[PDB]
Ligand binder design. Structure first.
Ligand SMILES: OCC1(Nc2ncnc3[nH]ccc23)CC1
Ligand SMILES: [Cl-]
Length: 167
């Protein structure tokens, strides 16, 4: 039993809700919130800009030190950093950016990072400003993630279409 509330069960391990991931994080304080990161951990907009703003820019400050030490992430890769006031940990995951021509096949690799954590609050990777088909992102999630994932989907109209086309 966990404290996630109001989610629709899609499969044995995947759940979904029409909500801002930032608000779900503020309410649940999950062990792991997933950020839809880019390789530079520049948290400007979308999920990343919203999470970072909610941390009063502490996420960005921590991220800049991470990059200065370690260099950029790989597309499809991830790192674990602090969750600040939103969660215990933030798993920064880089899905491919279709607008930059990055290989959508890397979306599966991106979701594989979720399997290192038993329970996660996550957005749809590569959706929104990242330019991929969100229906496809949900399919890859369900077919790749084996741990328990709670998907917060900000856009109401998007949430409605994701549910209806699933089974
Ligand atoms: O609409 C779904 C998507 N975006 C978001 N999802 C969850 N929480 C969010 N907070 C800000 C943006 C945002 C993935 C594209
Ligand atoms: Cl977005």
């Amino acid at each position: 039993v966990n404290s996630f509330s109001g989610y629709l069960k899609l499969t044995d391990n995947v759940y979904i809700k029409n909500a801002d991931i930032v608000e779900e994080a503020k309410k649940v304080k999950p062990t792991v919130v997933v950020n839809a990161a880019n390789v530079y951990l520049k948290h400007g907009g979308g999920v990343a800009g919203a999470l970072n703003k909610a941390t009063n820019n502490a996420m960005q400050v921590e991220s800049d030190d991470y990059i200065a030490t370690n260099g950029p992430l790989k597309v499809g890769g991830s790192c674990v950093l602090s969750g600040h006031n939103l969660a215990k940990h933030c798993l920064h995951v880089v899905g491919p950016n279709v607008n930059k021509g990055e290989d959508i096949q890397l979306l599966k690799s991106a979701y594989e990072n979720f399997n290192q954590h038993e329970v996660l609050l996550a957005p749809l990777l590569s959706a929104g400003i990242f330019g991929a088909d969100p229906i496809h992102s949900l399919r890859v999630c369900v077919d790749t993630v084996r741990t328990n994932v709670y998907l917060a989907v900000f856009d109401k109209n998007l949430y409605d279409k994701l549910v209806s086309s699933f089974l």
